[PDB]
Assembly symmetry: D2
């Protein structure tokens, strides 16, 4: 199944935050309406926050997370959870290797803000 794609409400601010847990340098690209809107890179085995930014979901509300290591796409896992019918989290994990820890880049999207 497709993973790392989320439909947000249109024209809505959201937070995106990426963490790294791998010997491989992570590249996190965050696409809004199929164009890169934020990019984070880094290498950590201790959950560094390799980036955090506020973006706008724009007219389509389509948000996609892509994770690659030196140009090789990582395998993604994802889901969205809603608390008290108001508070939204879009969650991504990624695997750059063979151990299937799926934490090599971890991306958290949250909305609403403010």
């Amino acid at each position: 199944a497709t993973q790392g794609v989320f439909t947000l409400p249109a024209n809505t601010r959201f937070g995106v935050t990426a963490f790294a847990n791998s010997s491989g340098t992570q590249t996190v690209n965050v696409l809004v309406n199929n164009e890169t809107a934020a990019t984070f890179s880094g290498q950590s085995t201790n959950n560094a926050v390799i980036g955090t930014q506020v973006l706008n979901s724009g007219s389509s509300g389509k948000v996609q997370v892509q994770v690659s290591v030196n140009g090789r796409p990582s395998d993604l896992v994802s889901a969205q959870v809603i608390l008290t019918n108001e508070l939204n989290f879009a969650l991504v994990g990624s695997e750059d290797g063979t151990d299937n820890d799926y934490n090599d880049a971890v991306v958290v999207i949250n909305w609403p803000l403010g």
Copy 2:
């Protein structure tokens, strides 16, 4: 129901990251085995990361998040999600006022690391 309490595997590193979305300064306490292990304080209406840390779940695995604003406890909402039976997210929202956005402090716990 109790919210903001999570059972992690024992003796396991985890990440905790807090975001703020309120006119009020948020104070987040992260407890391990009922004792505060991290405190983050900050003020943002734009989802700023007010703190991030790596902690160890220790012998009990018990992790609790508490949020206060102007010396008063916020109401919490929480859940845990597991992706591909490997990647864990413990999610907390908090409400310090009357609008029930539950984003006033947002806390994300993730494990495993490395």
Copy 3:
């Protein structure tokens, strides 16, 4: 925080299914747009499926679950999860006693159907 309230897409068929795990007789009310649309009842400590129904979310999309036992309202916990940005589950647990298992009536809402 409020629990057991979900916003579905308007005019959308959904499934609602109730499970019982308590010595107390469960009564589960399912409200659509603040009017009772389904009532299920039973008594099981082995997860009996006391009801399952297909309902339509109608113009408002508002669905609320309430649970009572021997005339007393149960405490609710809830969340919504979305898989592959398409498959939706709205989840409720309820507690009628002292043990905080929150399984006394369990309600799962799923959409889309067909």
Copy 4:
């Protein structure tokens, strides 16, 4: 990533319940410690319950859901959600065709029971 595999607490009763939403007859196999423990088959386009059963997670706690239609494996999506650190849902959707609704068989695993 692997989907439909869940680690339950050992020696714990759990519920498994399947729904169908497809022109294809669904076959749901539930494996405990890699051995078939339950099988449900049925056909519905209206979310009918095609099976429900109570199983024991046994010494390993390993539970796996597989779905096939006319002997062809469906693609799966899954996650686990925990409410109030007590109430567990292991959720599976499956796709037997081209529309990516992932509801063709829906499988809900819930624990604890009782």
